[PDB]
Design a protein around this ligand. Sequence first.
Ligand code: JXJ
Ligand code: JXJ
Lengths: 395, 399
Amino acid sequence: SRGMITDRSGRPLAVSVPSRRYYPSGEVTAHLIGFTNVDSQGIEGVEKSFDKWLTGQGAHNLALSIDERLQALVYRELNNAVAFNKAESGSAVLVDVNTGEVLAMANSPSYNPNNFAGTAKDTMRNRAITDVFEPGSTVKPMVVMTALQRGIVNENTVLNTVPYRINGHEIKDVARYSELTLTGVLQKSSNVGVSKLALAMPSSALVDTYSRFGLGKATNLGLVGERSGLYPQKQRWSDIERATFSFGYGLMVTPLQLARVYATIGSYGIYRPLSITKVDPPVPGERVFPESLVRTVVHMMESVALPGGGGVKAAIKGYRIAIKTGTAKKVYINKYIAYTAGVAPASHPRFALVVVINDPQAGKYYGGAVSAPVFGAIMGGVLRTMNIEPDALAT
Amino acid sequence: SRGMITDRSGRPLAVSVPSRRYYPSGEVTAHLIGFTNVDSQGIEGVEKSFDKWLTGAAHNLALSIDERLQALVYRELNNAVAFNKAESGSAVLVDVNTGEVLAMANSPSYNPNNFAGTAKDTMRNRAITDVFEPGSTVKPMVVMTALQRGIVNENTVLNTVPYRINGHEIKDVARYSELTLTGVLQKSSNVGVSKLALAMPSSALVDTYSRFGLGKATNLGLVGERSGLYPQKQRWSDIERATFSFGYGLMVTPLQLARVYATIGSYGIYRPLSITKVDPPVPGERVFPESLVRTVVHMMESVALPGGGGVKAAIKGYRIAIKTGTAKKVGPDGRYINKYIAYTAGVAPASHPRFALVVVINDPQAGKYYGGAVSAPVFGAIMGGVLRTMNIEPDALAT
Ligand SMILES: *C(=O)[C@@H](NC(=O)/C(=N\OC1(C(=O)O)CC1)c1csc(N)n1)C(C)(C)NOS(=O)(=O)O
Ligand SMILES: *C(=O)[C@@H](NC(=O)/C(=N\OC1(C(=O)O)CC1)c1csc(N)n1)C(C)(C)NOS(=O)(=O)O
């Protein structure tokens, strides 16, 4: 008599069979759904967080925000990229930018909850809500928004981007560019450009912006192990600290937290609470940042996926996409977190997606190289499955 | 440098990327497709079988597989193996009209994008390397043979009371004093089929099973493909003749069993199997009279209807003609052991079969083991998925 867990259209994701739980999508949705005791008590995932409701104490089924179609194609691309790259793990989160609904939440490696007794404990725990990594360059769109808002730069400002040092600390870019446009700063992911941008604003500037986009804040899905990251509450910020903050050092985020950042970008500055339950719209959320300013930086982000930008391998024929790649050293070692985060379609964003691939060991590790292809594969599938009409005008 | 392997509609299943081999369906199609070594040479599955073709131009290769069908087959099978705590499972789906293998899946699987140290025994393609005794899945051929020889007619009632011959007990799961010929299949009456077999020469059933391809090579060219264990005895004891009629004394691969049921589905037309896309007309050869097979296919519908052992395979809106099976496994000392193979084999839709499906679950250990309890729900979920995906018009008629 246990409540049946379904996706947002009623597709069964956990069901009692005459009694035993059966999970029809098995390892595709294992971390989110969780599993139960022999007492049919929930001990992981939604099975645990909604156990009282599942027991009927509060018909008592549960329709998640998940779309199983999207969950399956997300898992397929993610799991096989983690294998192909000999990575420790990967996480992918897709969010509806209008509603805050988690449309997909996948991790690799996964396990089969229909028979989990032998699975390694660490494999069982979800990584999209418990793993915390430094976000790296995925914060630079928030840097650019801040600098514009504070009028320290203008839409077409050209920045000098030659490298330099703060107190002996060398600030350099992947490739050397004398100068870059504001767009170019994002397009080439210029640590110099962002660092110079940060150095002309108080230390509080970026600390406010990142929080407004939800970094350092709880995700509030109510899932066990859910994690809020570490976020800097330093009273005084050092010049090196002030500069490395503009490209993802000194704070730590879960994949879910990052997905919410990009859902707030996608909505042009409306912060919406995440949900794992199907949401009946509208959801008002909070206007955390001016729409015109976010709108402008979203357009600048399209250059990341065009020739010349670092995430061009995420390009999808027919659709504008506004993305940002990242690469972060793990804690420092010669092992890396490969990031691609983005919204689509860029003309009117519907979906925010983050792809995080942890410790790729197949010879390649740069975000644009490792997870940008996966972003394009996933988001291309999402756009088709959701009948989104193409975005790119023939030229 | 290396051709692409695709499904029958061009979906990529093995692709070279700048280079390295990548498998977009990963573990879903692992056993069939196989993998390459470091120097991009195939060493398992299609990658090896077609290695020369794939690497003069490097040609792409369109399998008969439909990735949509492969995925839903693997989904049901893999979760059923896990749920049942089974050693393994195999599922094969064959196009009744062409012989094309539309899906071929096993569980447990592995990810060919990183086959690091997965057990050798997880990486072999059990659909073609596992041999099990087919048990009651052979029974439709017994009835066909008995009808052809005129020892029974379509409406004969058989005494199915339990009896012992030469010290061996012949008994049904449930006891029934008598059964129609349809009842014999509906209830899977060892008693009934044993009496049909004993009224015929030993060569009768040996010949029929062979005409449906048992004991014959499957000929896919895949590494490790097996042909089974098939009797070549001149002399048969009465007990051997009887147990042969409920599937003792021979061992088949899941693939071989699927060809049997494809041959049932075509109403007696035997067709070579194919894992490459075929240009559609495949005439095959008639091996048994159409009317007789048609008659037994209708009889087989009772297996999925109230009173039949495979009722849990029922699919709303579609007629299906199936046979369940449960066989004692032969242990490592050559004697039967307390472990089982759970079978369900069948064709759909029963009005005009298009698909043959076999589901084989090896050693379920979660409290159930009979084919009707273990494999039949899996057959139903898979085939219902197949019929919908292929846009088959419902055949069920409201009553
Ligand atoms: C943006 O992510 C930015 N990343 C960095 O500066 C970091 N590491 O880069 C190094 C690497 O070899 O990958 C160490 C040089 C970084 C920030 S926080 C953290 N824990 N590690 C660069 C590399 C400029 N662009 O990354 S990209 O994917 O946009 O190309
Ligand atoms: C048909 O498969 C028939 N099965 C048998 O006679 C066999 N074993 O039956 C036993 C069991 O496991 O229940 C051992 C008593 C058999 C044939 S060949 C082989 N190696 N083992 C029945 C009993 C009718 N199967 O039940 S069914 O409803 O699945 O058809």
